[PDB]
Short mmCIF file of C-alpha atoms in Angstrom, two decimals:
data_model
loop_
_atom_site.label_atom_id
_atom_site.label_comp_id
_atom_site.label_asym_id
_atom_site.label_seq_id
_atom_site.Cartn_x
_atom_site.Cartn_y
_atom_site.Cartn_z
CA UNK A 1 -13.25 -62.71 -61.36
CA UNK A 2 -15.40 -60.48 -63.84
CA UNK A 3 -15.79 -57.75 -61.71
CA UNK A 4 -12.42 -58.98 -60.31
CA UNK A 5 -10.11 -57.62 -62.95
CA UNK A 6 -7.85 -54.92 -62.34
CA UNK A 7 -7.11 -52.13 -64.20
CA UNK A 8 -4.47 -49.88 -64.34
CA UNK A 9 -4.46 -47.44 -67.20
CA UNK A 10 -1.09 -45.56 -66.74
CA UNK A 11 1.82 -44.37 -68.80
CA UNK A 12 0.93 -41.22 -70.61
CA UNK A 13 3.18 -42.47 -73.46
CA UNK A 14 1.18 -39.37 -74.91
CA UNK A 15 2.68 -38.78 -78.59
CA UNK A 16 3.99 -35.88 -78.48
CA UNK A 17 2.43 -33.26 -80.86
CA UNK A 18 0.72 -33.50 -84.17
CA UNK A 19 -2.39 -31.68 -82.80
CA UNK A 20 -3.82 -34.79 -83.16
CA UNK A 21 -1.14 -36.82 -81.25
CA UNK A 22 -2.74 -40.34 -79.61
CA UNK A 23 -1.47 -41.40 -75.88
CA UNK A 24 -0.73 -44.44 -75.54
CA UNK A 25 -1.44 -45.97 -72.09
CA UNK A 26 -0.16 -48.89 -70.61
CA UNK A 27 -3.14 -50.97 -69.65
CA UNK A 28 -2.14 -52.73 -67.28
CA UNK A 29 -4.66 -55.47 -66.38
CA UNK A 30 -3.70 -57.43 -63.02
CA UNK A 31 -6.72 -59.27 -62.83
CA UNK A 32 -7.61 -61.96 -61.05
CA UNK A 33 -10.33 -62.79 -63.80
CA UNK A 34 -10.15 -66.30 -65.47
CA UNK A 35 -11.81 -63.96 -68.41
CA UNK A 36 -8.48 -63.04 -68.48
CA UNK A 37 -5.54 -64.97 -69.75
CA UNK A 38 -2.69 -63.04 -67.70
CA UNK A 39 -2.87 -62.33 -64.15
CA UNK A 40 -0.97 -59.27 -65.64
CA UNK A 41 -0.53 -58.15 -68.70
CA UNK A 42 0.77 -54.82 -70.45
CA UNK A 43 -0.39 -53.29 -73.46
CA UNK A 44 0.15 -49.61 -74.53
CA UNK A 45 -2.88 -48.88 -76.20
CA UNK A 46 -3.43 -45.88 -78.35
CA UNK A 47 -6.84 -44.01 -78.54
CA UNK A 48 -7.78 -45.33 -82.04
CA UNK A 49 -7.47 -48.92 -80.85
CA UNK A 50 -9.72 -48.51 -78.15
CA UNK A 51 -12.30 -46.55 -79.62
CA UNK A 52 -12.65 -49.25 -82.65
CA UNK A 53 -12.29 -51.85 -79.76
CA UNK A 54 -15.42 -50.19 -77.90
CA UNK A 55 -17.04 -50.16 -80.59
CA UNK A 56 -15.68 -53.74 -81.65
CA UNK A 57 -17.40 -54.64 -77.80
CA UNK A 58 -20.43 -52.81 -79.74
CA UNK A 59 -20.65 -55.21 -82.60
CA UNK A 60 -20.06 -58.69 -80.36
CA UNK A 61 -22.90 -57.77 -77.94
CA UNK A 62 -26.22 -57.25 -80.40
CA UNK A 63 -27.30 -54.76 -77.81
CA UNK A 64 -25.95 -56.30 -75.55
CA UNK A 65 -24.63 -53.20 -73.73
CA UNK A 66 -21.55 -50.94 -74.88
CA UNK A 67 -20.99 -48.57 -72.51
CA UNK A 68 -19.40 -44.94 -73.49
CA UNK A 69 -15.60 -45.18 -74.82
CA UNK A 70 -12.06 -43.57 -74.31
CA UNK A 71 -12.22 -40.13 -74.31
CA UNK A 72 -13.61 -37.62 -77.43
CA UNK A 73 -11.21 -35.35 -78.81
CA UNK A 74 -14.62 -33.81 -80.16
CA UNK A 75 -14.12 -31.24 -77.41
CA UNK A 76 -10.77 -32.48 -75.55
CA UNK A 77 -7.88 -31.10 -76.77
CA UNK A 78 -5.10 -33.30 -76.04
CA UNK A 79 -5.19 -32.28 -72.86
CA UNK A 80 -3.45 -33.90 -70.10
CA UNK A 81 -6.94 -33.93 -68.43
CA UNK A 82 -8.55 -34.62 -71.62
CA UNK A 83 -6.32 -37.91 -72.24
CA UNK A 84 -6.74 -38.88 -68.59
CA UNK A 85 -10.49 -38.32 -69.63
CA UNK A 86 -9.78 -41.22 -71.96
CA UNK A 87 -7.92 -42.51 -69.49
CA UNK A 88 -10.93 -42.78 -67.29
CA UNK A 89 -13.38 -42.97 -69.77
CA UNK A 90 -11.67 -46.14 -70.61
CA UNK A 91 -10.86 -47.12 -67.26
CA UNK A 92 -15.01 -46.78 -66.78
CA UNK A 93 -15.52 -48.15 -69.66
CA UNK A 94 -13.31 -51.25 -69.12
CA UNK A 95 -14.59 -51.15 -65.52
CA UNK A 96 -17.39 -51.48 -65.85
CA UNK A 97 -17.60 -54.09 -68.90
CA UNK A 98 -15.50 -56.28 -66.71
CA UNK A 99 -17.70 -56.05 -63.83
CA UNK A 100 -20.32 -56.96 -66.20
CA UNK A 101 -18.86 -60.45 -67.26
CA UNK A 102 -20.05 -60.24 -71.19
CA UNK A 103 -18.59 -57.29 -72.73
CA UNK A 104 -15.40 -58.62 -70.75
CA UNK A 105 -15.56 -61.56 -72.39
CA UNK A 106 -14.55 -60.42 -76.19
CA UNK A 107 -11.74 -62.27 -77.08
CA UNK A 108 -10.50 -59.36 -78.67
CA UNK A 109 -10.85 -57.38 -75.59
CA UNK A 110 -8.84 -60.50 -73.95
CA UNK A 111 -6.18 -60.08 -76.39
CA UNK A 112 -6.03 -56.68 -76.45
CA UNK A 113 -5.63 -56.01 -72.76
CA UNK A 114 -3.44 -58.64 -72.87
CA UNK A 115 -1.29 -58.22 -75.77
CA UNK A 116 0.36 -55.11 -76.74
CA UNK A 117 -0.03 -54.93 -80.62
CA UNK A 118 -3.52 -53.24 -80.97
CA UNK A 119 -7.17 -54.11 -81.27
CA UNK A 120 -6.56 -54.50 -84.88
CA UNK A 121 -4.02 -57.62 -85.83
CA UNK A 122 -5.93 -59.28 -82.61
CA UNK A 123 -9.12 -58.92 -84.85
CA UNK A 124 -7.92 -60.67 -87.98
CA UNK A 125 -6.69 -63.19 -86.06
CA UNK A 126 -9.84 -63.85 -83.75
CA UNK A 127 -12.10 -65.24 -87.20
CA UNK A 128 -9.19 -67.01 -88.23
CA UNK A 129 -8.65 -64.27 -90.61
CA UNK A 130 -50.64 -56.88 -69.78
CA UNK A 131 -51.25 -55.54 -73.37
CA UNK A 132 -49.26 -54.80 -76.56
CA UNK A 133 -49.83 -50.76 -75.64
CA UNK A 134 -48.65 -51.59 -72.01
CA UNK A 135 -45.14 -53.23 -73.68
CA UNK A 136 -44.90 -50.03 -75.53
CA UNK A 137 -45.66 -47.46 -73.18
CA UNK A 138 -42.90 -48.29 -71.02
CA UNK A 139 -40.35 -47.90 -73.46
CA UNK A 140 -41.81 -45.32 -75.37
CA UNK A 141 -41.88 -43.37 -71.26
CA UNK A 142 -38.54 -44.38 -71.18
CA UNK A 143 -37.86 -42.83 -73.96
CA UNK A 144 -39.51 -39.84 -73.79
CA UNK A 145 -38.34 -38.72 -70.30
CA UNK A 146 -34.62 -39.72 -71.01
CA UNK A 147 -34.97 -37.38 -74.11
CA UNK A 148 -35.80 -34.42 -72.33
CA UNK A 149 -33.30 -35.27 -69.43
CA UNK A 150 -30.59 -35.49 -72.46
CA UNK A 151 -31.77 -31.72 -73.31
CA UNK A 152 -31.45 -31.05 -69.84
CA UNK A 153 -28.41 -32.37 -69.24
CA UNK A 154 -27.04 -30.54 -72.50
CA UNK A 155 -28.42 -27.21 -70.97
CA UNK A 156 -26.57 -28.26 -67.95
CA UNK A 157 -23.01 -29.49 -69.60
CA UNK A 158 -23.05 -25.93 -71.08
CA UNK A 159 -24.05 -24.37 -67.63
CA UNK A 160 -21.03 -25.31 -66.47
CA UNK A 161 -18.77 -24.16 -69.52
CA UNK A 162 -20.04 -21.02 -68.73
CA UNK A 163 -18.64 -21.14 -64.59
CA UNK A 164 -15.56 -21.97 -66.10
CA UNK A 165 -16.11 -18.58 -68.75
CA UNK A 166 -17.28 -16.75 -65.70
CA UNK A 167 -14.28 -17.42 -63.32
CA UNK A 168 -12.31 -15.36 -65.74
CA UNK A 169 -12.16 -11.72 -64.67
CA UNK A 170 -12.75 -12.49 -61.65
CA UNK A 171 -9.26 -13.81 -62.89
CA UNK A 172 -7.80 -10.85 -65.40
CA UNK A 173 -9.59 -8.67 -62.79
CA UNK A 174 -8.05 -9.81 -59.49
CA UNK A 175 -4.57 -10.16 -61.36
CA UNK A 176 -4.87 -6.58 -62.57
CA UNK A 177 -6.49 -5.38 -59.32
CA UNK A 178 -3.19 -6.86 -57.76
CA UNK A 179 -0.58 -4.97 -60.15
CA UNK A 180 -2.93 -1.95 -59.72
CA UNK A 181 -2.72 -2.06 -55.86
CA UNK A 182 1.46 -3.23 -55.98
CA UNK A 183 2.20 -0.40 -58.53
CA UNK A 184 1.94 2.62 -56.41
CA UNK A 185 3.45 0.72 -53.55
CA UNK A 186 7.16 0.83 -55.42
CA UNK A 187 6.62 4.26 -56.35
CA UNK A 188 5.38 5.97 -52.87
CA UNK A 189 7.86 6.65 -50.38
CA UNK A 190 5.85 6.35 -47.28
CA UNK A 191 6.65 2.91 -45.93
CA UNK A 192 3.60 2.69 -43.75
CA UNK A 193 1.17 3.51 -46.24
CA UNK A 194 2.97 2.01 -49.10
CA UNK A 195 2.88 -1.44 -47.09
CA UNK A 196 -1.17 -1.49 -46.57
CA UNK A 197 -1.43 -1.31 -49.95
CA UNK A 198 0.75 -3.82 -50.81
CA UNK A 199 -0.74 -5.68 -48.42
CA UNK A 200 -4.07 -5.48 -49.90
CA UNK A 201 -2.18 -6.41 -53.36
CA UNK A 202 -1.14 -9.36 -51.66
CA UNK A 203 -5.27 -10.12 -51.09
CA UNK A 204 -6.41 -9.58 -54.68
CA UNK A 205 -3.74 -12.38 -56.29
CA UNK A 206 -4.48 -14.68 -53.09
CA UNK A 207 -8.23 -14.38 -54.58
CA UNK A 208 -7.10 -14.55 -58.07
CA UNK A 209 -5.45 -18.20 -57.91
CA UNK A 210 -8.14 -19.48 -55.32
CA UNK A 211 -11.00 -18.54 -57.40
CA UNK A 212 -9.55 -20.28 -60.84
CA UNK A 213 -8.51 -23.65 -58.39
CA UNK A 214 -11.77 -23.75 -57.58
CA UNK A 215 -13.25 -24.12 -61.06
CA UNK A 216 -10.82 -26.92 -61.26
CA UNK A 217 -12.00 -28.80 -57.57
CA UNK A 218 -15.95 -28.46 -58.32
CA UNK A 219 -17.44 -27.20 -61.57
CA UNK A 220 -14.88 -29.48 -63.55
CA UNK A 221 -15.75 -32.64 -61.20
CA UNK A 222 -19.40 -32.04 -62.21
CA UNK A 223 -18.53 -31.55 -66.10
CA UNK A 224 -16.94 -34.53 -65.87
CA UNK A 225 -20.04 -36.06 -64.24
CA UNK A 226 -22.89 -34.91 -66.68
CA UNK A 227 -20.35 -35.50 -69.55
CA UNK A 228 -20.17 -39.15 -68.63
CA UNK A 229 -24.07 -40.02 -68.67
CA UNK A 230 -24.39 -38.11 -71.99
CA UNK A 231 -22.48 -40.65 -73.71
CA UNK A 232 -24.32 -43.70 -71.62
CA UNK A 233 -27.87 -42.26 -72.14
CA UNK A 234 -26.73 -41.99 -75.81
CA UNK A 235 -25.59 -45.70 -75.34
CA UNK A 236 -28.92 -46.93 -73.97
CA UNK A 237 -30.15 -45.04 -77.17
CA UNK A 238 -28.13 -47.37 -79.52
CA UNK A 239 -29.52 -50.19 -77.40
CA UNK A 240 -33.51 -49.02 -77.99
CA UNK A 241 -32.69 -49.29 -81.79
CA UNK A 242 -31.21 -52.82 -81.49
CA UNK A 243 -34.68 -53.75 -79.46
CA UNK A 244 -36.92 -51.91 -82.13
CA UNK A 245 -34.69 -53.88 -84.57
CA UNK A 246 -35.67 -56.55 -82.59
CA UNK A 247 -39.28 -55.88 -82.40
CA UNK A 248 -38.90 -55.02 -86.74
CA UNK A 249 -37.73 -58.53 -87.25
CA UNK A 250 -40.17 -60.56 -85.40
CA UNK A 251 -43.15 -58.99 -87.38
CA UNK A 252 -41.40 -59.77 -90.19
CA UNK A 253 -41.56 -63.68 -88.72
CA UNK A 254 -45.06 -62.86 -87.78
CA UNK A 255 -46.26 -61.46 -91.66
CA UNK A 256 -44.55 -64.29 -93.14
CA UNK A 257 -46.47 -66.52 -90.91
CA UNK A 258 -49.62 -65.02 -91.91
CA UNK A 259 -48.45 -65.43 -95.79
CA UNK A 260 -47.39 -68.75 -95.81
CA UNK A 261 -50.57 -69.79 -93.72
CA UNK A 262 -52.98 -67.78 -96.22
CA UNK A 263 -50.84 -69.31 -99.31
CA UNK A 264 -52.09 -72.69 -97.39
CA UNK A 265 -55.81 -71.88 -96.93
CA UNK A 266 -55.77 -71.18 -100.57
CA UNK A 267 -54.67 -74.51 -101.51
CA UNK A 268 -57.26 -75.69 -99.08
CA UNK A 269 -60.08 -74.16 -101.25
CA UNK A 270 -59.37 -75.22 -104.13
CA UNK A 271 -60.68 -78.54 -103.20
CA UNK A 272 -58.27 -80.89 -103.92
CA UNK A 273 -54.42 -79.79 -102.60
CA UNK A 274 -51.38 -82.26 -103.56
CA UNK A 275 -50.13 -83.84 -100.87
CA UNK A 276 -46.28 -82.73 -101.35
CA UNK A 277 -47.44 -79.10 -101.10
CA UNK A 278 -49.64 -79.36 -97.89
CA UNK A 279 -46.61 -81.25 -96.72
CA UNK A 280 -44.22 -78.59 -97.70
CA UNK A 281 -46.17 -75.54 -96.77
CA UNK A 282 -46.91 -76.69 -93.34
CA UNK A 283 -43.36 -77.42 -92.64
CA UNK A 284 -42.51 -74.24 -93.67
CA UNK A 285 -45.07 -72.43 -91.58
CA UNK A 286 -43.98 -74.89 -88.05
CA UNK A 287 -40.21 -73.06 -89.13
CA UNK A 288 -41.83 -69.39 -89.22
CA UNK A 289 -44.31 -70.34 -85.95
CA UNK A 290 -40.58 -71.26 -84.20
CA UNK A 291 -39.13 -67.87 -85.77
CA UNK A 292 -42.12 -65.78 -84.66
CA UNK A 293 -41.53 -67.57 -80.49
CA UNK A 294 -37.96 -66.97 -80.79
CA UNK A 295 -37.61 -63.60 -81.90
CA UNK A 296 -40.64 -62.95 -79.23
CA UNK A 297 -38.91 -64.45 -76.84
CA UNK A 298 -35.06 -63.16 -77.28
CA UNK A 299 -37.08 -59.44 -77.55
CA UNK A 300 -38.99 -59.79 -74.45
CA UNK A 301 -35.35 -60.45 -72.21
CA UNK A 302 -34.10 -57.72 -74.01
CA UNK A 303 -36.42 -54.81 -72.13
CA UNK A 304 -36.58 -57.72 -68.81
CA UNK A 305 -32.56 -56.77 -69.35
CA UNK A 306 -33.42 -53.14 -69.96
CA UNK A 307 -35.13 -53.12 -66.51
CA UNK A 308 -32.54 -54.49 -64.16
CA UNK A 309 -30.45 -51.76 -65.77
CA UNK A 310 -32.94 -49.07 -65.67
CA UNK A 311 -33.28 -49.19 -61.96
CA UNK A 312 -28.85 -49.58 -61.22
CA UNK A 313 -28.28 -47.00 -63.52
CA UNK A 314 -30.38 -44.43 -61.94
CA UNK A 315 -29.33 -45.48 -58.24
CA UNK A 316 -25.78 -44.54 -59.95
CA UNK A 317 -26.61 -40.94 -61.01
CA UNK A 318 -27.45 -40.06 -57.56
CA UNK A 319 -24.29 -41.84 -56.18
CA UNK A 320 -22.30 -39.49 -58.30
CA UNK A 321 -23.72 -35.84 -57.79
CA UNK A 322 -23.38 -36.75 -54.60
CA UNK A 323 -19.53 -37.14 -54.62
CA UNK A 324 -19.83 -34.05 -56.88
CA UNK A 325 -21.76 -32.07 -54.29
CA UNK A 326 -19.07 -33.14 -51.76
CA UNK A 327 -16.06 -31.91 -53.84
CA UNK A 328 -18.10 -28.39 -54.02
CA UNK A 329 -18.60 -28.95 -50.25
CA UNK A 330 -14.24 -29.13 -49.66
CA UNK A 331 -13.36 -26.11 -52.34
CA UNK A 332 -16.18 -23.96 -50.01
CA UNK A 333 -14.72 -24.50 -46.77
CA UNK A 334 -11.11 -24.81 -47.74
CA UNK A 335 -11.99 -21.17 -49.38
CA UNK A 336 -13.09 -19.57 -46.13
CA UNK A 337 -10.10 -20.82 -44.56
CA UNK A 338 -7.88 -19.19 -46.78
CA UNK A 339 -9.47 -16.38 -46.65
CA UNK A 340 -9.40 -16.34 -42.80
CA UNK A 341 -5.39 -16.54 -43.74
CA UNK A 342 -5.19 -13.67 -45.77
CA UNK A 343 -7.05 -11.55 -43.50
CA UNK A 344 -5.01 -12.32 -40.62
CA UNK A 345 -1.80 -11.32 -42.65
CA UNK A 346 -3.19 -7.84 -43.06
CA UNK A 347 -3.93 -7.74 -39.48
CA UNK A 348 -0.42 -8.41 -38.86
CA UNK A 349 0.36 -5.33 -41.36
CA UNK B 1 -61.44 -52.03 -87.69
CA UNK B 2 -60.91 -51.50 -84.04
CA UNK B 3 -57.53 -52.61 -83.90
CA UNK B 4 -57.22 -50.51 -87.02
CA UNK B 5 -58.07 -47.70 -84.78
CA UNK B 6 -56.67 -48.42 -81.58
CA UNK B 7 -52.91 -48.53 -83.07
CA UNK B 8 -53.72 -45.00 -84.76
CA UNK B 9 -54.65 -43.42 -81.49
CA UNK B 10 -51.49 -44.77 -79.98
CA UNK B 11 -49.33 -43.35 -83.16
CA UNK B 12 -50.97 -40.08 -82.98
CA UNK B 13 -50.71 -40.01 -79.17
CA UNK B 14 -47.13 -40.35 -79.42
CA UNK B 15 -46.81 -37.55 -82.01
CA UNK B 16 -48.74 -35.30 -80.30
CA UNK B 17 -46.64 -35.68 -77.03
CA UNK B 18 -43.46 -35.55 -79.19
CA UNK B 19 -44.42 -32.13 -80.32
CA UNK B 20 -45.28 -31.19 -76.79
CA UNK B 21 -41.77 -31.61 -75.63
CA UNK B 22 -39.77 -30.00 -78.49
CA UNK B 23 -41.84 -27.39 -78.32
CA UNK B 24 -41.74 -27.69 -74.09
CA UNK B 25 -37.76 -27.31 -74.76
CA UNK B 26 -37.41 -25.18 -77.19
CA UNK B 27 -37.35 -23.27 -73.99
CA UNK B 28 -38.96 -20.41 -75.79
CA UNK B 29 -42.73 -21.58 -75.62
CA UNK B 30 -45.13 -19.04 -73.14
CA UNK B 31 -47.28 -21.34 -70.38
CA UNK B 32 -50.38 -20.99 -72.24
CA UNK B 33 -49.79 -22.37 -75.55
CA UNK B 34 -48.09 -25.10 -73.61
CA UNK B 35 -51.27 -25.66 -71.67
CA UNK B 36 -52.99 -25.62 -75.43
CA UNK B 37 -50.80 -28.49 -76.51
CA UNK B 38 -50.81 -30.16 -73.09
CA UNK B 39 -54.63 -30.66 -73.28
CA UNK B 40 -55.02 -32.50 -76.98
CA UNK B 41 -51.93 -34.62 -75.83
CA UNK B 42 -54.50 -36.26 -72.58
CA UNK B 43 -57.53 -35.56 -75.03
CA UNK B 44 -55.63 -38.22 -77.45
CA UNK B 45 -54.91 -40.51 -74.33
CA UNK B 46 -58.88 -40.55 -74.07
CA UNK B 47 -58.82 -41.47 -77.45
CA UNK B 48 -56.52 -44.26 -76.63
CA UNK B 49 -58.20 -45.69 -73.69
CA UNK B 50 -61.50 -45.37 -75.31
CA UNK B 51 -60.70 -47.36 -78.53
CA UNK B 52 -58.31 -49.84 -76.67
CA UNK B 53 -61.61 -50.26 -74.32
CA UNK C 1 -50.78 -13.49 -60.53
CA UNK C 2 -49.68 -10.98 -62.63
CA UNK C 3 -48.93 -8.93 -59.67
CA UNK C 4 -46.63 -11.69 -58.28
CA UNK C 5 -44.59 -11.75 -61.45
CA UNK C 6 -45.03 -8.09 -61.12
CA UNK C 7 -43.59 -7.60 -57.59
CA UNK C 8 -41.26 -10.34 -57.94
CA UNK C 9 -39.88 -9.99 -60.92
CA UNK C 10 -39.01 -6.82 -63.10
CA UNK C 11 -39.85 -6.73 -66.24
CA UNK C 12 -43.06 -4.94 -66.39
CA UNK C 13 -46.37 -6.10 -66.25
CA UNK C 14 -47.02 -6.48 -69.58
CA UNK C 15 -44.82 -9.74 -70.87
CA UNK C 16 -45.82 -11.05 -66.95
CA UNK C 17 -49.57 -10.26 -68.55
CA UNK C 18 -48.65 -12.51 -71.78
CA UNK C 19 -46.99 -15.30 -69.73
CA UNK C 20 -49.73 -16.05 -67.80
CA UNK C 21 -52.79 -16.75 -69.86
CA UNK C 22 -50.15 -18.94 -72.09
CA UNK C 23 -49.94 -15.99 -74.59
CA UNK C 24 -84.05 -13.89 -57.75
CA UNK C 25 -87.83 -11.93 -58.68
CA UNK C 26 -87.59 -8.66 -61.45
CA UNK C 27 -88.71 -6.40 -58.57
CA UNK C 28 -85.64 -7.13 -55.83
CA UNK C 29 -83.09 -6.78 -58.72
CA UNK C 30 -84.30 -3.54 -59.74
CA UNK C 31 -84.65 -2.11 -55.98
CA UNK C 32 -81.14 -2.79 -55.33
CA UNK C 33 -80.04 -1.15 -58.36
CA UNK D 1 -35.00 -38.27 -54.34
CA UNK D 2 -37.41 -35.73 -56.01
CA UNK D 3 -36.70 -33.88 -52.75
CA UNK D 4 -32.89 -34.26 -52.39
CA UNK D 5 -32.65 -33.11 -55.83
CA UNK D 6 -34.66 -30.48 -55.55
CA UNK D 7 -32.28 -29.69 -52.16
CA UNK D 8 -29.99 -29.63 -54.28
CA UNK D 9 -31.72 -27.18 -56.11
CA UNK D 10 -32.72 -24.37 -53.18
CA UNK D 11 -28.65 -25.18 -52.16
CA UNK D 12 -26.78 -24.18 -55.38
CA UNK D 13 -28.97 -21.36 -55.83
CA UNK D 14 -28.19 -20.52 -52.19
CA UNK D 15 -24.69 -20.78 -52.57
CA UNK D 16 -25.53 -18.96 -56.16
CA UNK D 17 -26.71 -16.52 -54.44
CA UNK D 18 -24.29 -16.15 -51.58
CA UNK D 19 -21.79 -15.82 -54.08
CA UNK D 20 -24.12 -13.39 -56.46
CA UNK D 21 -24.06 -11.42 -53.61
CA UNK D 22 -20.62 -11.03 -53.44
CA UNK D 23 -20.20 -8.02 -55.71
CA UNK D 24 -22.89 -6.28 -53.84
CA UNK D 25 -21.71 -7.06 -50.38
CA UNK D 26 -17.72 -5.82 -50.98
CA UNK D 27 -16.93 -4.93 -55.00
CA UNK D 28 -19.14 -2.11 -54.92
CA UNK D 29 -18.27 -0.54 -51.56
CA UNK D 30 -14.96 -0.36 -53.24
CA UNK D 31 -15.86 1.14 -55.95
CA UNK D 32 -17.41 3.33 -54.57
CA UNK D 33 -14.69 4.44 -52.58
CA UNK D 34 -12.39 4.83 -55.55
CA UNK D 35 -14.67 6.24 -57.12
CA UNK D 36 -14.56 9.06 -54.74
CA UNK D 37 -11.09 9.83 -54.83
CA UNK D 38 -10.65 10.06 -58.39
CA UNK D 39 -13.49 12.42 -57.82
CA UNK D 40 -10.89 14.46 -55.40
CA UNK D 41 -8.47 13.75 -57.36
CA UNK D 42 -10.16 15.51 -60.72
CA UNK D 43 -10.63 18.07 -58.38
CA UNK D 44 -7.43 18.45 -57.46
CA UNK D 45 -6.81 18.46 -61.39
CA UNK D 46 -8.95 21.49 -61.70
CA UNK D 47 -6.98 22.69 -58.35
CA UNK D 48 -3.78 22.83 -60.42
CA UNK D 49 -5.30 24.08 -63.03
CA UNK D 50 -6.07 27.29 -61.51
CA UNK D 51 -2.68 27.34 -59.84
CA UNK D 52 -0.76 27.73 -63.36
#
């Protein structure tokens, strides 16, 4: 049922221009969940209502995961791809939260998937309105190499902004190359010399739109790929500063503790205490001894929690480049083919 | 005092391996004033596992 | 070393030259001399 | 996976380099060519020339 949701995100009800224009999706949910109301519902959800709602799936899960969101604009354009970015980066995002029963189970989420009127009015109406060093140098390892994978994978993310730049004449070239070799075949009057070279025209703009479809099959499926964990590995990021939070708060249990116990000792030594006060103290220093176990305790699940998803998450990343390495693997071959093609038509010239 | 000292290796040691890796990419650092920090950042893990010791 | 970044790459020996440093008895001694 | 990934390194460079080779292989034997008969054809230029 959590995992077993289903999610259609459909219906580029894309506003039409503004240059800032939000698409509105159906979200469709068929889901078999019973973390969701309606086997079906419909909404038609614009960007904005997501993005608050991602981040509304943020604030109802303390850290508490929160994948990445919809789609950022902060590059996209309101591209067709770009929206079906947001499309997919909430159909991810969505997918993933209900296959992780939680995050799934915001109400407002619940509403929102299945109720068209956006996250918003559905939010009023929700609130009726080993060693110490040991602990740390696992996170702090963590931290560290995900850091300098993040620069990597920034390095990387513009790698491939640069294929796409370098397809490109290649592109002008080969379309240019193409009018050069076609413009002399109108204009000479030797049929079986002017046909060669129109033939070899015809080779230059086959190479011209096979080149720039490429970009599109492979380099684009891995800029989608790296763009993806960049927002997750800036996710788990946001989750580390919950847990530090986390870890900020119980010493503040802990020095209060230590307070309230040396206020007591005090008492102690002056050799005759009241009876109310050793009373009172005490009490209040059992309260901060359960405040100091709890806030241990809820801490310590949070990295066990950190853990499980450490090791799925980084199963996933290979999972990926290899479907990425396999769409490079069709473009290549599918190339040569063509290729075979067009130099079989000049054969036949 | 030890404890003192043993957290103060630790915050050092993660300062000093910070500044390795900005200055690691920064991607404009030559190998051998890598290998300069590289050193003092396992000189301060010594300095860690000898005070935590 | 140098002379592997030298062969194998071009771009002189000199910044392959920075790169790599990260920037018996008194009678016998004599006789062979 | 160090080594897949790595695989993956020797690969794209391989490919890279298949492709980096490209120019090498076929754009320059062209240009080559045409080079050389624009160089006739300056020639040719000059041939006129001494015509008129």
């Amino acid at each position: 049922a959590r995992p077993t949701f289903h999610i259609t995100v459909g219906d580029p009800h894309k506003v039409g221009d503004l240059a800032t224009s939000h698409i509105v999706y159906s979200v469709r949910t068929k889901t078999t969940s019973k973390a969701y109301k309606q086997p079906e519902f419909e909404v038609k959800r614009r960007y904005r209502d997501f993005l608050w709602l991602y981040n509304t799936l943020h604030s109802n899960n303390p850290g508490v995961v929160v994948p990445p969101p919809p789609e950022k604009q902060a590059v996209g354009r309101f591209e067709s791809n770009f929206v079906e970015s947001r499309r997919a980066a909430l159909e991810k995002m969505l997918n993933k939260i209900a296959a992780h029963p939680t995050l799934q189970l915001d109400a407002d989420l619940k509403l929102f998937l299945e109720s068209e009127s956006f996250n918003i009015d559905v939010k009023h109406k929700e609130r009726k309105e080993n060693k110490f060093v040991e602990q740390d140098d696992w996170f702090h390892d963590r931290r560290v190499y995900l850091d300098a994978l993040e620069n990597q994978l920034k390095a990387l993310l513009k790698a491939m902004d640069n294929m796409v730049a370098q397809r490109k004449a290649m592109a002008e070239a080969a379309a240019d190359f193409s009018a050069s070799l076609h413009a002399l075949s109108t204009v000479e009057l030797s049929p079986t010399l002017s046909g060669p070279l129109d033939a070899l025209s015809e080779l230059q703009l086959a190479i011209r739109d096979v080149y720039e479809r490429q970009a599109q099959q492979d380099v684009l499926t891995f800029g989608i790929i790296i763009e993806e964990y960049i927002r997750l590995i800036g996710s788990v990021k946001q989750a580390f500063s919950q847990r530090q939070k986390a870890f900020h708060s119980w010493h503040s249990a802990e020095s209060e503790l230590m307070k309230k116990k040396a206020a007591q000792d005090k008492l102690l030594r002056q050799g005759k205490t009241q009876q109310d006060r050793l009373n009172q103290v005490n009490a209040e220093v059992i309260d901060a001894e359960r405040k100091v176990h709890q806030a241990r305790l809820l801490f310590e699940d949070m990295g066990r929690l950190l853990r499980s998803e450490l090791d799925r998450f980084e199963r996933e990343k290979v999972e990926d480049f290899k479907s990425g390495v396999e769409t490079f693997l069709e473009s290549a071959v599918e190339a040569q083919k063509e290729l075979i093609e067009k130099w079989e038509t000049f054969l036949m010239q």
